């Protein structure tokens, strides 16, 4: 059954495109970045020292987390609380890479990600290492990319080209596409154009 | 005039003791941990990547911060907003060490701390590196400490090792500091003790 992995950096509209690709394939959708963000919110609220990986590992043994695989009903639950809003806040955005870098944390989420994928049948799974690490035997692997400039304009309008260009260098020396991935430059494209493009690639 | 530095780990009541010492000496009070917490709140709200020191340095060039040196009128203002509550929340508590470890950040706050101290006359300045780095020629230097056990119960051993071996500002008393074990003492007992030490030097 069909597993589509969608990876790439931020600011390209990756998440919206993956959602809409899922709807069009009648498939399920899995937002992996949201899972990291949920754990991050959990860590922040316990007040764990973010400079201490062992403390982050210890504090994330039993994160009471739930996420939907329905692209039309995405909710982020933590301890029964709907945390869809706070997991997108700047606090979590600033903290998420501290928590994501802890191996113990990845180990669990990669496992949770694999299980959700196997039990979802037809599924589009979105993130950064889906095609390389999490689901290396995906049927189709897509790497959505865009120029620094394109990505910068999508952010400064959300409300930068310096900030976005900086993060590219630190990531390179710290995002790498799988060998069998299909690289798609979305710089010139709108969302619907990107969706149609991926539908074409998948249906080939 | 008189500059009293009070340093030590967390969980001994250090801040309450330093406040009350200030009141009793008729001195001013400076809560330096608050200043790190205010910057941290600023960083968190800008959504700066905490794993990136250069980004934290860049995002903290111009932190609009204000803090009082009056022990009875402590407020923590950021961009005009009273942030006394949020700077004590867990989010900031968890993040503050990431931000505190950035040299550029310390460099500024240490400078701001020295200036506030000079202009406050008689002042008790509280923190972790006050007697060693910020005010190394304080008149009286106090290192408030307590056993792991005592500190643990007041929450109702890991952090001790990480603090000891930390890169930017490891936690160590000045050679000329007066080490005071507060394990057996209540707060008012500690206050009386420091009043005695200060009124003997
Ligand atoms: N597969 C993934 C997905 C997200 N992440 C983390 O999540 C953050 C942003 O997540 P989003 O994909 O939700 O924007 C990144 O900074 C990264 O640290 C990750 O480390 N691996
Ligand atoms: N003088 C100081 C005071 C605080 N700090 C930092 O500020 C944090 C918060 O201090 P408080 O918990 O005492 O407010 C400490 O955990 C430490 O990371 C520092 O590095 N130097």
Secondary structure in 3-state letters for chain A = CCEEEEECCCCCCHHHHHHHHHHHCCCEEEEHHHHHHHHHHHHHHHCCCCCCHHHHHHHCCCCCEEECCCCCCCCEEECCEECCCHHHCHHHHHHHHHHHCCHHHHHHHHHHHHHHHHCCCCEEEEECCHHHHHCCCCCEEEEEECCHHHHHHHHHCCCCHHHHHHHHHHHHCCCCCCCCCEEEECCCCCHHHHHHHHHHHHCC
Instruction: Name the DSSP class of B101.
Output: T
| Contact between residue A181 and residue A7 where contact means Cβ atoms under 8 Å apart | yes
β partners of residue B158: none
Looking up tokens 């304009």, which residue turns up?
Answer: A153
Angle at B40 between CA B163 and CA A35, to 5 degrees: 90
Other CB atoms within 10 Å distance of the CB of residue A161? 13
> Any bridge partners for residue A65, and if so which?
A78
- State whether residue B144 is helix, strand or coil: strand
This structure's resolution (Å) is 2.7
| A53 contact partners, CB below 8 Å, separation of at least 6 | A101, A102, A103, A104
Does A94 sit within 8 Å of B91, measured CB to CB?
A: no
Q: Compute, in angstroms, the gap from residue A36 CA to the centroid of ligand 1.
A: 6
How far apart (Å, rounded) are the C-alpha atoms in residues A26 and A120?
A: 12
Helix orientation angle between A161-172 and A148-156, rounded to the nearest 10 degrees: 130
Rounded to whole angstroms, the Cα distance separating A31 from A109 reads 12
Measured by CA distance, the residue closest to atom 12 of ligand 2 is B33
Q: What is the whole-number distance in angstroms between the Cα of residue B51 and the centre of ligand 1?
A: 14
Do residues A126 and A113 lie in contact, with contact meaning Cβ atoms separated by under 8 Å?
Answer: no
A 10 A CB-CB count for A22 gives: 25
DSSP SS3 for B53: helix
Contact residues for A176 (Cβ-Cβ < 8 A; gap 6+): A132
Find the residues whose C-beta lies inside 6 A of ligand 1: A 10, 32-34, 36-37, 96-97, 100, 127-129
What domains appear along chain B, each with residue ranges and CATH number?
Answer: 1-201 (3.40.50.300)
Residue A173, exposed/middle/buried by CB under 10 A (0-12, 13-18, 19+)? exposed
Chain CA centroid to CA B76, Å:
14
**Residues facing residue B142 across a β-bridge:** B6, B178
Say how many CB pairs under 8 Å bridge A and B: 64
Residue B97 and residue A44: Cβ atoms within 8 Å?
A: no
Structural determination approach: X-ray
In angstroms, the separation between the Cα of residue A188 and the nearest Cα of chain B is 28
Question: Residue B187: helix, strand or coil by DSSP?
Answer: helix
Residue position matching structure tokens 């505190």: B100
B149 burial (CB, 10 Å; 0-12 / 13-18 / 19+) is exposed
Query: Which residues 6+ apart lie within 8 Å of A167 measured at CB?
Result: B49
Task: Write out the residues of chain B at the interface with chain A, using a CB-CB cutoff of 8 A.
Answer: 43-52, 54-55, 89-91, 93-95, 97-98, 101, 158-159, 162
User: What are the distances in angstroms from CA A161 to CA A144, A149, A152, A155?
Assistant: 19, 6, 5, 9
Q: Compute the distance between CA of residue A154 and CA of residue A194 in angstroms, rounded to an integer.
A: 15
Spatial distance between the Cα atoms of B32 and B168, rounded to a whole number of angstroms:
16
């Amino acid at each position: 059954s069909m597993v589509v992995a969608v990876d790439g950096p931020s600011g390209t509209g990756k998440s919206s495109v993956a959602k809409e690709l899922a709807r069009q394939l009648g498939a399920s959708y899995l937002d992996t970045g949201a899972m990291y963000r949920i754990v991050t919110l959990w860590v922040l609220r316990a007040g764990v020292d973010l400079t201490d990986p062992a403390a982050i590992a210890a504090a994330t043994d039993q994160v009471p987390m739930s996420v939907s695989s329905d692209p039309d009903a995405q909710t982020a639950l933590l301890a029964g609380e709907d945390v869809s809003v706070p997991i997108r806040g700047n606090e979590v955005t600033g903290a998420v890479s501290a928590v994501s870098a802890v191996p113990a944390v990845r180990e669990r989420l990669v496992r949770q990600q694999r299980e959700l994928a196997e039990s979802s049948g037809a599924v589009v799974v979105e993130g950064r290492d889906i095609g390389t690490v999490v689901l290396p035997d995906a049927d189709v692997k897509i790497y959505l990319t865009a120029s620094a400039q394109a990505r910068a304009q999508r952010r400064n309008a959300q409300n930068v080209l310096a900030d976005v260009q900086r993060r590219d260098h630190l990531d390179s020396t710290r995002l790498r596409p799988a060998e069998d991935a299909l690289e798609v430059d979305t710089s010139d494209m709108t969302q619907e154009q990107v969706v149609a493009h991926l539908l074409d690639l998948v249906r080939t």
